[PDB]
Amino acid sequence: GPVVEKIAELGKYTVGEGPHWDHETQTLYFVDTVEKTFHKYVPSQKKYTFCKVDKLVSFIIPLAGSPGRFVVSLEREIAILTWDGVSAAPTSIEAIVNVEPHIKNNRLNDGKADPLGNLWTGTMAIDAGLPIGPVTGSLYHLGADKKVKMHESNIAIANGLAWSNDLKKMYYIDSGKRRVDEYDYDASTLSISNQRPLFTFEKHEVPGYPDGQTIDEEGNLWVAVFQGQRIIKISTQQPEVLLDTVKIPDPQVTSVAFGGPNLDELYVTSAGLQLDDSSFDKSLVNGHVYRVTGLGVKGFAGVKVKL
Ligand SMILES: [Hg+2]
Ligand SMILES: [Hg+2]
Ligand SMILES: [Mg+2]
Numbered sequence: 001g002p003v004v005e006k007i008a009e010l011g012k013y014t015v016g017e018g019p020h021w022d023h024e025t026q027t028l029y030f031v032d033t034v035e036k037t038f039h040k041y042v043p044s045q046k047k048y049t050f051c052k053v054d055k056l057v058s059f060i061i062p063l064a065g066s067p068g069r070f071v072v073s074l075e076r077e078i079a080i081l082t083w084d085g086v087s088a089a090p091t092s093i094e095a096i097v098n099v100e101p102h103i104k105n106n107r108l109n110d111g112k113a114d115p116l117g118n119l120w121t122g123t124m125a126i127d128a129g130l131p132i133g134p135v136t137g138s139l140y141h142l143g144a145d146k147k148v149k150m151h152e153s154n155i156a157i158a159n160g161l162a163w164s165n166d167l168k169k170m171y172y173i174d175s176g177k178r179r180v181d182e183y184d185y186d187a188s189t190l191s192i193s194n195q196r197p198l199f200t201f202e203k204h205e206v207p208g209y210p211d212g213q214t215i216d217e218e219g220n221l222w223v224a225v226f227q228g229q230r231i232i233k234i235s236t237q238q239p240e241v242l243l244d245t246v247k248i249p250d251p252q253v254t255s256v257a258f259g260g261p262n263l264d265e266l267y268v269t270s271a272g273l274q275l276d277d278s279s280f281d282k283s284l285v286n287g288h289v290y291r292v293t294g295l296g297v298k299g300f301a302g303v304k305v306k307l
Contacts, residue, residue, distance in 0.1 A: 001246075001294070002246050002292050002293065002294040002295050003292070003293045003294050004246065004247070004248060004249070004268075004290055004291075004292050005290060005291045005292075005293070006249065006288050006289075006290055007041070007043075007288065007289045007290065007291055009041075009046050009048055010039075010041060010048060010288070010289040011048075011288075012272050012286050012287040012288055013032050013035075013039075013269070013270070013271065013272060013287040013288075013289070014032055014034045014035050014271065014272055014273050014287060015032055015033045015034045015035075015252075015254060015271040015272075015273050015287070016030060016031075016032055016039075016254060016269035016270060016271060016287055016289055017030065017031050017032065017033045017058065017059075017110075017212070017254050017255055017269055017271075018030050018031040018033070018058055018059040018060060018110065018111070018212070018255060018269075019212075019255055019256065019257035019259075019267050019268075019269050020059070020060060020061055020062075020257060020302040021257045021258060021259035021263075021267065021301060021302045022062055022301075022302055022304075023259075023263070023301035023302070024301075025042075026042065026043070026044055026259075026261065027040060027041070027042050027085075028040070028041040028042075028043070028257070028259055028267055029041075029060045029061075029062075029070070030060070030269055030289075031057045031058060031059060031060055031072075032057070033056065033057065033058050033109070034056075034273060036052060036053050036054060036055060036056060036057055037050050037051060037052055037053075037057070038050065038051040038053075038057060038060050038070075038072070038081075038083070039051075040085050040086070041289075043259075043260070043291075049085060049086045050088065051081075051083055051087070051088060051089060051090060052088055052089055053074060053081075053089070053090065053093075055074035055075040055077070056073075056074075056075050056107050056108075056126070057072060057073055057074065058073045058107070058108050058109045058110060058111065058121075059071075059072060059073055059108075059110065059111035059112070059121065060072050060081075061111070061112070061113055061119070061302070061303075061304060061305045062302075062304045062305070063080060063304060063305055063307065064117055064304035064305060064306045064307075065304075065306075066080075068082060068083065068084060068085075069081065069082050069083075070083055071096075071119060071305040071307070073107075073108035073109075073111060073121065074093070074095075075107055075108070076098050076099050076100045076101070076103070076106055076107060076108055076123065077095050077096070077097070077098045077099075077108075078095075078096045078097050078098075078099065078108070078119065078121070078142060078148075079093055079094060079095045079096055080093070080094040080096060080307075081093055081094075082094070096142070096146050096307070097142070097146050097147065097148060099121075099123060099140055099148050100123055100138075103123075103136065105125060105126050105127065105136075106123045106124065106125060106126065106136055106137065107123065107124060107125075107126050108121055108122070108123055108158075109121070109122060109123065109124045109137070109157065109158040109159060110122065110158055110159045110160055110161060110173075110211075110212060110255070111161070112160075112161040112162075112303075113302075113303040113304060113305045113306075114141075114161075114163050114170075114185075114190075114303070115163055115165075115167060115300075115303055116167075116187065116306070117303060117304060117305060117306030118141050118142065118143060118190060118305075118306065119141060119142040119305045120139070120140065120141045120142075120161055121139075121140055121141075121142075121158070122137055122138060122139040122140060122152075122155055122158025122159075123136070123137040123138055123140075123155070123158055124136065124137040124155065124156065124157045124158050125137065125156075128156055128157050128176075130156075130157070130175060130176060130209060131176070132176075133156065133176075134156075135154055135155070135156045135176065137153075137155035137156065137157070137158045137174075138150050138151075138152060138153045138155060138158075139151045139152040139153075139155060139158060139172065141190055142305075142307075143190060146307070149190070151191065151192050152172075152192075152195070155174045155176075156174055156175065156176030156177070157174060157175035157176055157209075158174065159173040159174065159175050159210065159211050159212060159213075160172070160173040160180075160210065160211060160212040160213030160214070160223065160224065160255065160256075161173075161213070162213050162214055162215040162221060163185060163215070164185075164215070164219060164236065165215075165217070165219060167185065167187040168184065168185060168187075169182055169183065169184065169185055169236065170182070170183045170185040170192050171183075171198065171213065171215070171221060171236070173210045173211070173212075173213055173223070175209040175210060175211060175226065176209075178200070178201040178202060178209060178210065179197050179198070179199060179200040179201060179210065180197075180198045180199045180210055180213065180221065180223060180234065181195055181196065181197055181198060182195075182196060182197075182198040182236070183195050183196075196239075197239070197240075198221075198234070198236065198239055198240075199221075199223075199234045199235075199239070199240055199241075199242070200240060203240055204240070204242045206225065206228060206232060206242070207225070207227065207228045207279065208225045208226050208227035208228030208229075208230075208251075208279075209225070209226045209227060209228075210223050210224070210225065210226075211223075211224040211225070211226040211253065211254050211255060212224045212254055212255025212256055212269070213255075213256065214256045214257055214258060214299060215236070215299070215300075216258065216297040216298060216299050216300075217297065217298045217299065217300065218297055219236045219237065220233050220234065220235065220236065220243060220297065221233070221234045221235075221236060222256050222266065223256075224253045224254055224255050224256050224268070224269075225253050226252050226253060226254060226271070227251055227252060227278065227279055227280070228251070228253065229247060229248060229249070229250070229251040229253065229280070230245050230246060230247050230248055230253060231245075231246050231248060231253060231256060231266070231268060231292070232244070232245050232246075233245070233246075233295075246292060246295075248268055248270065248290055248292075249286075249288070249290070250270035250271075250272075250284075250285070250286055250287065250288055250290070251270075251278070251279070251280040251284055251285055252270050252271035252272070252273070252280075252285055252287070253268060253269075253270050254269045254270055254271050255268075255269045256268055256269075257299075257302060258298070258299025258300065259299075260293075262298065263298045263299045263300065263301065264293070264295065264297065264298045264299070265291050265292070265293050266291070266292040266293075266295060266299070267289065267290070267291055267292075268289065268290040268291070268292060269289055270286070270287050270288060270289070270290070271285070271287050272285055272286045272287025272288075273285070273287070
């Protein structure tokens, strides 16, 4: 079976999240969605750094054409951070847009660029809760003239995103729905339609909640299972097909990104935050970062945001 390695060099995270693999610099970036920190890991050189801000963060993606600059979330603001990748604070912050200026207790959560470079991201109540809590989030993309467009409402916990290689489908996760949805994606108008369930956890006895996700070159989705101690591999060719399961020692698996020189090493983030209604005792909940090899598939380099 696959080899799951705990990356000792990286330590433990409250809620490690938002992994992004920059292929040209062979560097993984990620966030902690509770501790207000960004993180950098260069595996070939065993280099780790962090960056502190005073707002809640949920993604970090290099800005296309601008070395040393990243598109990030700061509470409800999408912003450009100028960061040298090693100092413990940004050099400067350039706000782009506040997606929800008048929803004082919302935050941005998972975000990713589509293959064309357009940032997609969604919101949630800061005090969202599972299985039931306030449902206040929406799904957006950032388009022309730095204005967002809304694509879906009634989202409890806005989470993982992926697109098919032919640019005809988008895949999206609201953790509260305990399923992955597929949509027809119109790359020319940047709109989605014909929402329908692709994979429903209760139909397959999968515990926990879908969180982050990514897609491989064959079109398989790799889905993080929060409170499931696993990642799952699911089909995009047929609905409701579980292809494989890979157990991850940390119960609170949060997200996934392919990396390594050949894009065949799956980085997996997790959360050490101990929750009062957990299916797992506290001794099990640590928050390490893992690397999975031997899956027999390759992914894609992380896409930079175009502004
Ligand atoms: Hg930073
Ligand atoms: Hg940054
Ligand atoms: Mg997430």
